[PDB]
Amino acid sequence: VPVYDTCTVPGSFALTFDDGPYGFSTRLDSTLNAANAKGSFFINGQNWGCIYDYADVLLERFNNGHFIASHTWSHVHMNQGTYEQLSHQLELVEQAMIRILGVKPLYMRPPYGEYNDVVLQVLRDRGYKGLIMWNQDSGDTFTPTPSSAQIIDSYRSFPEKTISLNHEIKDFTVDQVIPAVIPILQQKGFSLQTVPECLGLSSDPADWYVRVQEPGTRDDSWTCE
Ligand SMILES: [Zn+2]
Structure with missing residues (x-):
């Protein structure tokens, strides 16, 4: 992998x-x-x-x-888990994407960027095509946290071919950083692509997943409890 x-x-x-x-x-x-x-x-x-x-x-x-x-089910420190626990961690996310979307993911990023040989072996055994890291960090989960203005300015210097880490769970990332940096990056000539396309793999979304079955309808099994 x-x-x-x-x-x-x-x-x-x-x-x-x-x-x-x-x-x-x-x-x-x-x-x-x-x-x-x-x-x-x-x-x-x-x-x-x-x-x-x-x-x-x-x-x-x-x-x-x-x-x-996938980012794992429980956001675990994957280096502290056994083969079996990691497989369960991946399987539970697969199951949720099968029920909601009808597909399994083919890629994943480890929480905290922590992985080892057992993680890579589980990914291989489970049919994953890649583990996606990053090469620039917005800083939006650093503590103390940079201001939006500071994060936006860092983006002004990220070079072409960057894979930038952000976190959806930070309100200012959604409401301040991303609305400001989309124009910065597009206006300077960058094409804002998904990771598979930017890696020269396929740009057709269907190639990023395994079709398993038709999407399900919400029932009592759609629970994390
Ligand atoms: Zn994370």
Whole structure:
């Protein structure tokens, strides 16, 4: 399983978001969609909300050509887990995407950027095609936290082919940073692409997932409890 941290397509730029969806996601996606920009989303199952409660956002996101990938179920320190626990951690997210969207993800990003040989082996055994890291950090979860103005200014110097880490769970990222930096990056000639496209893999969204079955309808199984 390859590890990726930088784009390869010239002029490309990957805005990525961890820990979502969240109560600001419809706003974020509206902002991206209005600019024809595509985001990359590494979602949790049960961390800042139960993924099943975000089904409507996930569906809009999925059908609008944004990249959705796994961030584990419980946002675990993956280096402290056994093969079996990590497989369960991935499986539970797969199951939620199968029920809501009809598909399994083919990519993932480890929480805290922590991974080891056992993680890569589980990814390989479970059919994943890549582990996606990053090469620039917005800082939006640093503590103390940079101001929006400071984060926006850092984005003015991120070079082409950046894979940028952001977090959907920070209100100022959705409401201040991303509305300001989309024009900065697009106006200077960068193409705001998903991670798979920016890596020269496919730009067709269907290639980022495994079709499993038709999406389900909400029933009593759509729960993190
Ligand atoms: Zn995270």
